[PDB]
Amino acid sequence: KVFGRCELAAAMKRHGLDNYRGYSLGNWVCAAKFESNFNTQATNRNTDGSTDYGILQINSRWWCNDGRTPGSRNLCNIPCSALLSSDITASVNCAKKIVSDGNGMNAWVAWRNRCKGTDVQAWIRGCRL
Ligand SMILES: [Cl-]
Ligand code: NA
């Protein structure tokens, strides 16, 4: 599923991400835009052989099991394919574990390079939330 901007903002809000660990909703919408272009089916392979999955491009080296990332952890305890669903629940629950891990949203490279320090409230402007 390819989400609309306000559709995704409302789904993330319902799942508890608005101000989760201090990060306003706009941060999460901005990250999803630049990680996956709001497409739950996005996948991208990394040089180390790991793969990034779903709307928030969660990585198989640490967070999910895809059966082909040797010596990986599965810290969200899920198959990576569960992160590609049109229901974002699994992605959100895993993201909450990631952002609690110590370096906050800097774990998402696109967030650090394209959202951090910008006017992220713009990503929820106009939405009925
Ligand atoms: Cl933080
Ligand atoms: Na893994």
Side-chain angles (χ1 to χ4, degrees), residues 42 85 104 117 119 124 128:
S85 177
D119 176 16
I124 58 166
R128 194 158 40 229

Side-chain angles (χ1 to χ4, degrees), residues 4-118:
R5 174 176 63 92
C6 296
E7 182 181 23
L8 178 66
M12 283 176 159
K13 189 183 180 164
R14 183 168 72 92
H15 287 277
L17 280 178
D18 187 13
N19 287 301
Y20 190 83
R21 275 299 206 289
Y23 290 93
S24 63
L25 194 57
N27 284 284
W28 297 100
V29 178
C30 187
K33 168 75 184 177
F34 293 126
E35 289 294 344
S36 71
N37 207 21
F38 296 149
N39 182 0
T40 63
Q41 296 193 79
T43 60
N44 285 289
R45 191 119 199 221
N46 302 308
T47 53
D48 64 0
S50 66
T51 299
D52 295 337
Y53 292 86
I55 204 156
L56 287 167
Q57 287 293 275
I58 290 168
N59 178 265
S60 64
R61 180 159 303 293
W62 302 98
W63 304 108
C64 64
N65 181 42
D66 67 2
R68 65 166 195 197
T69 307
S72 71
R73 311 242 59 200
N74 179 10
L75 292 173
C76 294
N77 206 43
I78 39 146
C80 298
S81 61
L83 300 175
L84 303 180
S85 177
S86 53
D87 177 343
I88 63 173
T89 298
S91 278
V92 166
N93 289 345
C94 187
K96 288 176 173 168
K97 284 192 62 123
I98 296 167
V99 70
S100 306
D101 197 51
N103 87 339
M105 284 198 76
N106 296 287
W108 286 278
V109 58
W111 179 83
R112 181 182 352 111
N113 292 330
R114 306 182 71 178
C115 302
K116 187 180 193 176
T118 74

